[PDB]
Design a protein around this ligand. Structure first.
Ligand code: Y01
Ligand code: Y01
Ligand code: Y01
Ligand code: Y01
Ligand code: Y01
Ligand code: Y01
Ligand code: K
Ligand code: K
Ligand code: K
Ligand code: K
Ligand code: K
Lengths: 242, 242
């Protein structure tokens, strides 16, 4: 029927899109990865030869450095750290900066995600619908001061998303001393609920305990961006669901 | 109105739930984090004292080890590695094992996620609806051999989810030599599109290039689990959206 053809076309398009993306990523990153591997191997060989580090103890050093990486950012299991971890868990971001080390903690986190994900999704959907209604009212009032079409709403939503992304990128560049492009990329990754973890905020000079205002601003910005993303998805994507 | 009260109640419940989760996580992880920090500090101090490593070169060693961590898993930017990265990107998992190092690569990844996320969502929704219809037909045929209620469908979906999770955990424990509980936790994290990245498959002894069958099985299991999760969300969660 129509549904079978539609889902077959969707699967074929997804597979072709995946193949194209894999080919492009390989062609763009193979040489860079090879050069980085060669340089890192040369540097580590030089350091090992200079310091005469034993081969057995090198693995211990690697394990210690890997395990102590989060601990270099301060205390990540305080009230602020636990709140940040819970926010990442409920939003399905998965930064990976801090992870539970106890089986009971892992089970509690699993139950927490199970009981919290649908609630967060419903709240975000309701907030996005309310924001869309408010934006429609504002646009109607502005047009009266100067009927609304779907293209106008789509353009307004896209402009709002771009403005929010630019504001977040500028704020993160000013705060964390990051590049504008890097801040924009990190903001896009955070707002898409992907969570690569390469760039994580509130991880410098113990900002989680000495800058409560910065933590509050980051939480508010994350919530606002998630609400805007949900509203945009409802406006453009949800119409094709049912 | 009703919508305002509903969204206010949702926000209040989410905030209370976040506070409770943060309190529990702190009370469960503070002592463990402190003990781990103390042990790691003692070990690193002992090693530095034994090897007389200069303070300036220790930072270089840490940076080299951190940058060379993915490269210890083999070549992560081959055809299989690029396909895995694209699959993680389109599914909003964000494992973080490999990340682009080029600005053009980052821009391409951003455009790729933007153009691929709604397509994957629509395909998963359609596949979940088809699976739900097939399960309903199978249940009707089984009952005839021996009307259907919503509670029966919910129970069947929960049992299917539990069985899929158990099968994936057993397979990953047999393949990656992981614990059953750890494999179950990793499978749950993967199927929830969270992506902590603490446990990543296809990262041992170059399995991405020497075990094509294992990679294919992992891809099929991930797709099946995502389809089952989408079907369950449509069955129980989507009814409260609109
Ligand atoms: C009307 C639209 C287009 C603009 C919206 C206003 C923004 C420009 C404001 C609103 C909230 C502000 C933020 C609120 C809180 C903070 C934390 C603040 O941090 C501190 O004061 C401690 C750290 C330090 O010492 O810098 C730095 C500024 C910042 C990011 C502010 C930057 C400017 C922001 C984004
Ligand atoms: C109607 C909506 C907009 C309400 C939003 C509520 C916010 C005003 C709350 C919710 C979470 C709160 C944050 C949750 C956790 C913390 C960590 C907390 O840190 C500590 O308690 C230790 C550091 C210190 O001693 O200050 C400081 C306040 C802060 C940033 C809170 C600031 C106020 C926040 C952003
Ligand atoms: C196995 C997993 C997927 C179960 C997930 C549980 C959900 C089915 C629950 C968890 C939170 C619940 C929500 C929590 C709070 C509210 C607000 C509540 O609003 C009111 O009570 C006031 C408005 C009115 O009068 O209806 C309506 C139900 C709702 C959306 C609930 C709907 C059902 C939800 C999503
Ligand atoms: C800025 C971002 C949010 C843009 C996202 C793009 C979407 C609006 C596009 C991308 C993939 C598209 C889908 C790709 C494939 C199909 C199958 C297609 O089915 C057919 O062609 C056969 C059935 C029929 O005859 O209609 C129907 C449209 C649909 C769902 C498309 C609907 C529009 C989608 C979701
Ligand atoms: C009807 C339901 C309850 C059971 C479904 C069947 C499973 C028990 C099968 C189906 C697919 C199978 C997997 C398909 C592919 C592989 C890869 C295979 O890897 C290799 O052959 C190379 C690595 C090695 O040398 O072990 C190991 C078995 C495994 C995980 C299989 C384990 C058993 C699985 C999960
Ligand atoms: C109707 C549905 C079920 C179709 C599903 C398609 C699968 C049968 C395809 C899609 C992606 C494929 C995989 C994509 C990438 C690779 C890496 C590829 O590795 C190499 O080319 C290098 C290693 C070598 O030399 O074998 C081996 C095949 C494999 C696992 C493929 C095996 C077959 C897969 C799982
Ligand atoms: K993630
Ligand atoms: K991650
Ligand atoms: K990570
Ligand atoms: K996600
Ligand atoms: K994620």
């Amino acid at each position: 029927k129509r549904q079978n053809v539609r889902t077959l076309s969707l699967i074929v398009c997804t597979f072709t899109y995946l193949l194209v993306g894999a080919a492009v990523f390989d062609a763009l990153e193979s040489d860079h990865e090879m050069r980085e591997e060669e340089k890192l191997k040369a540097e580590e060989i030089r350091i090992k030869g200079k310091y005469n580090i034993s081969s057995e103890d090198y693995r211990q050093l690697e394990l210690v450095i890997l395990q102590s990486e989060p601990h270099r950012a301060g205390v990540q299991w305080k009230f602020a750290g636990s709140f940040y971890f819970a926010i990442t868990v409920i939003t399905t971001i998965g930064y990976g900066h801090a992870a539970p080390g106890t089986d009971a903690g892992k089970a509690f986190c699993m139950f927490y995600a199970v009981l919290g994900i649908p609630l967060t999704l419903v709240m975000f959907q309701s907030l996005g619908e309310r924001m869309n209604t408010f934006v429609r009212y504002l646009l109607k009032r502005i047009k009266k001061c100067c009927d609304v079409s779907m293209e106008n709403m789509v353009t307004v939503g896209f402009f709002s998303c771009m403005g929010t992304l630019c504001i977040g990128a500028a704020a993160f560049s000013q705060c964390e001393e990051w590049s504008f492009f890097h801040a924009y990329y990190y903001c896009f990754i955070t707002l898409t609920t992907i969570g690569f973890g390469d760039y994580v905020a509130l991880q410098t000079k113990g900002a989680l305990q000495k800058k409560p205002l910065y933590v509050a601003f980051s939480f508010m910005y994350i919530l606002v961006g998630l609400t805007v993303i949900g509203a945009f998805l409802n406006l453009v994507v949800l119409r094709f669901l049912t």
